[PDB]
C-alpha cells in the first residue's frame, strides 16, 4: 500500500509570464496597483503617526507624485509613503502571492481597523506591461534608503542607496517601453489615473519637478505640467451619512461616471452580518444610451473595494432588470478575482443581488412619496420593472405596488393599481383591465362600453410588454383580472 | 552599493486561496473545464490515430459519460481520453501554471488541424468551486492508473488506483458541497452540457435510472438506461463542406438549438494561415420571439475555441448586429484568459470579427441565389442588417448591395439594391427607404434604428 504525499509547488518561470499576460488584460494595470500601494503606505503613516506624532519627521505632508521623463523614458513615481525595509522588499514586494497586509495584521492583531487594499501582493508584477525595467527608491521614516530594481524577469536586484536621500516616502523609477512611450504622455498618465485611481484618498500631486538646465540661452518653456485636482483629488468621500452633503456626492458621482449633472437619488447604507459593506448607490438622472445597444459594456454599478475601483461588469452583480443603477459599493469583505475585476462567490453574488434589489425597491418606495421624482423614474426606467414583473416572480407583488398606470378618471397621469384597489365597488369581484395601443381606442371599445355606462373605471395599460405581462398576473389583490379574453362577455353576480 | 539577488518565492498558502475564490466566475464552470480537458485528451488520441491507428485498440468509441448520483452526492465523469502519466499528473495538476496542452501544441506544427484547448494548467483547479473533495482517476495509454486525491489544502496525495477498471481515459469523482446538491440533477446536467459541450466533437452519454415495475411480481426489469441525448449535434465543420446535405443540415440545426423548426442559411468555411479558425453558421427561418426577453443571454455565436465553448460574450469576438446568427466558431490560436472566460489580445478578436463580417456577406450572397429564401431572410432578420448598417463603417458600403427589400411596388418579391444599382436612375436623388417601426419604388424601413441608417447610407456607390 504505497502512499505518496507531495506539497503544492509552482512552475514560476511560466508563472510570471502567466500573471503578466493573462491575469491583467491591459497594460494600464501597471499604475493602479502601485498607486493603491502608495495609498496603503500613506494610511500606514496615518495610523502609526496619530498614535505618535513624533514619527511625523521632516515633511509632515503626505502625497504622491508622478515624474515621467520623455527624454530618458524613466518613469519616476515619488510618494511620501511608509517606504521599504529589507524585509519589505524581500517578502512583501519581492515575493509572489504574498503581501504586506498579512504581516501588518500579524503585527497588529487586535483592533487594527484598517481596510487597506494591499492584500494580493501580486499587483506589483503588473508593472512589466509598460516598463521593461523597474526600479524602486524607497526610504522608511526609520529605516535607511534602499534600491529595488528588476529587469531580467527571473531575477531581481537590490543595492544600498548612498546618493540622494528621500527621508519620507518611495520613489518608484520605471522605464516605459519605447514603443509604448505614449504612456509617458502626461495626458495618458492623468487619464489612466482617473480611470483606475480616481478616489484613492490622497492628493496625487503629479508634480513633475523640472530638470532645470542652467543656461544665448533659452527661456522657461516646460513651466509646469498639469497639477489639476484630478490626480491630486483630496478625499471627501470619507464622510459618513451624517455629514454627507448632496452636492459633494453629486460631484463625486460626476467624477466617477465622467458625468456633468448630479444624481437623481442617493442611497447610502451599511448592510451588516454575514456581509458587511457600505454602498454609495445612486441613480442616473437620465437613462443610459445602451438601450438599443444591449450588448454594450454596461459599467453602471462601479463596485469598489477599500476605496479601489474593481467592478465594471455590472451584469452579473445584479439581475438585469436593475442594471441601470449607477453607484459605488465600498465593501471590506467581498472576495474579488485575482485581477480585481469580477466577483466570484456567486452564492454571495445572489445574496448581494437580493439585498441590493430590496434596498433599491425600498428607495423607490422612498422615491414614491415625492410625485415628480417618481414620475421621472417611471419615464426613465419603468421598463425594467415591467420585465421583473414579467419573469421575476418573487418580487412581482413588490413591483406591482411600484407600478403606475392610467385609468378612466385619472386622465393621463399614471397612478398605482392600489388606487384602483382604493376605489373598487362591492359588486365588483374582479378588477377591470384592458390592453391596447392607446387609452381612448379601448375606452370607446365595446369591451368596456358596457362597463362605461355606469361611469366605471378600467385599467388602461399600453405597451407590448404590457400585452405580454397580463398572462403572468392571473389575479391581483386577491381578485382575478377582467378581460374579454380572460373572462369573456360574462356578468358576475353577488 | 553592494548588490543582492533573489531566488524563487511564491506563497503557496495565498495561491489557491486566490485560485478557489479569486479565479472563476461561476461555480458550474467546474464541469466545463473537465469536459474541455477530456475532449482535449480525445483530440490527442484522434491525432495519434491519424498518425498511428494501431494504439487505439484500448478503445474505439471516443465518447464521454456522465453519472449523476443524488444518493451519494457524487459526480462521476468517465472519458476515453489520452489519460495521465504520474509525472504529467504532478507537473500539471499538482503544479500550477504548467499545461501539457501547450507543450503538445508547441511540440508539433504540421498538424495545424488538431485542436489543443487550454494553455496554462489551472482550469482543473476550478473543480474546488463546488467539490469539497476531488478524486480524479486516470490511466494513460502508456502509464498505469494513478488517482488524484486532494482538497487544495496545501498538499496533494496520489498513488496507484485499484478501484473501477478504467479501460481507457480519465475518471473524475467529486464529492460536492451539501448545499450545492442541486447540481446533481439530471435536468441541470443536461442544461449545462448543452450550453457548454453540445458540439464537443464526441458522444456524451448521460445515464439515468429508469422506471421498473416493482413486485413487477412477474418480471422485474432492469434499473437504468443510458441516454446519449447530449451532443446530438455531431461535429460537421471538422468534416468537409461538400458532404453536407439537408438531413445533416436539419439535424445539426435542431440539436444545436432545441427548436422544432429548421435552418434558413448555412455558411461553412475555414480560414487558415496566420489566423486558423473554422466556423459553422446557422440561421433560423423566423425571427426569435424571445428577442425582447433579455433573460435569454444574447449568445447566438458560441465561440468554441478549439472545439470547446470558451465564453459567449459578444462584446469583442462578434459585433452586436450579428446577434441573430446562431452558430459555432472553431478557433485554434486564441490567447485565453486565466479562467477561460475573457480575452486579452483584442487585435485577433478584431480581425476575426472582420473575417466573420466578410463571411456573412458571403452567406448573404449564397442566399442571394434563391430569391424567395433570401426574401424570407431579409423580412425575418432585417433588424440585424440595418443595425450593422448603423454600427459598422468598415463594411458599410459592402453590406448595402446585399440587402433585399419589399416595397410599395415590388409586392411580395424582395428587390436588391445590387440589381437596383445596376439599373441606377439618373433622375434619382436619394435612395428610397423611409424609417419606420414596421410596414419611384420606395422601401419601408422596418426598424426605428433606420434613422441612423439614413444617417449612414446617405449615398452608396454614387446613389
Ligand atoms: N507605497 C508602496 N509602494 C509600493 N509597494 C508598496 C507600498 N506600500 C506597500 N507596498 C507593498 O507592495 C507589496 C504589494 O504589492 P502590489 O503592488 O502587489 O499590491 P497588492 O498587495 O497586490 O495590492 P494593491 O496593488 O492594491 O496595493 C505589498 O506586499 C505591500 O506591502
Ligand atoms: N481530463 C484531462 N484530459 C487530458 N489532459 C488533462 C485532463 N485534465 C487535466 N489535463 C492536463 O493537465 C493540465 C491541466 O489543465 P487545466 O485543465 O488544469 O488547464 P489547461 O487545460 O492547461 O488550461 P486552462 O487553465 O485554460 O483550463 C492540462 O493543461 C492538460 O494537459
Ligand atoms: Mg500594491
Ligand atoms: Mg484546463
Author numbering:
A (entry chain B): 10 to 224, 267 to 545
B (entry chain A): 10 to 224, 267 to 490, 507 to 530
Q: What does the report in the manuscript say about this coordinate set?
A:
RAF kinases are integral to the RAS-MAPK signaling pathway, and proper RAF1 folding relies on its interaction with the chaperone HSP90 and the cochaperone CDC37. The stability, subcellular localization, activity, and MAPK signaling of RAF1 depend on its interaction with molecular chaperone HSP903. HSP90 employs ATP hydrolysis to aid the folding and maturation of diverse client proteins within a multi-chaperone complex involving the kinase-specific co-chaperone CDC37. HSP90 and its homologs function as dimers, wherein each protomer has three structural domains. CDC37 facilitates client protein recruitment to HSP90 by interacting with the client and HSP90 to aid their association.
During 3D particle classification, we observed a substantial population of HSP90 in a more open conformation, lacking RAF1 and CDC37. To characterize this population, we solved structures of HSP90 in which the CTDs are unresolvable, dimerization occurs by the NTDs bound to ATP (ADP + molybdate), and in which most of the MD is resolved and participates in dimerization. We refer to these NTD-MD HSP90 dimers as a “semi-open state”. A semi-open state map was reconstructed at 3.5 Å. Unlike the closed state structure, RAF1 and CDC37 are unresolvable in this map. Similarly, the semi-open state map revealed HSP90 dimers formed by NTDs bound to ADP-molybdate. In the semi-open state, the src-loop of each HSP90 protomer is directed toward the center of the dimer interface, contributing to dimer interface interactions. This conformational shift of the src-loop in the semi-open state prevents the formation of the luminal cavity observed in the closed state. Similarly, in the semi-open state, F15 and F17 (HSP90-B) interact with F165 (HSP90-A), forming two of the strongest stabilizing vdW interactions (−3.29 kcal/mol and −3.14 kcal/mol, respectively) in the HSP90 NTD, where the β-strand swap occurs.
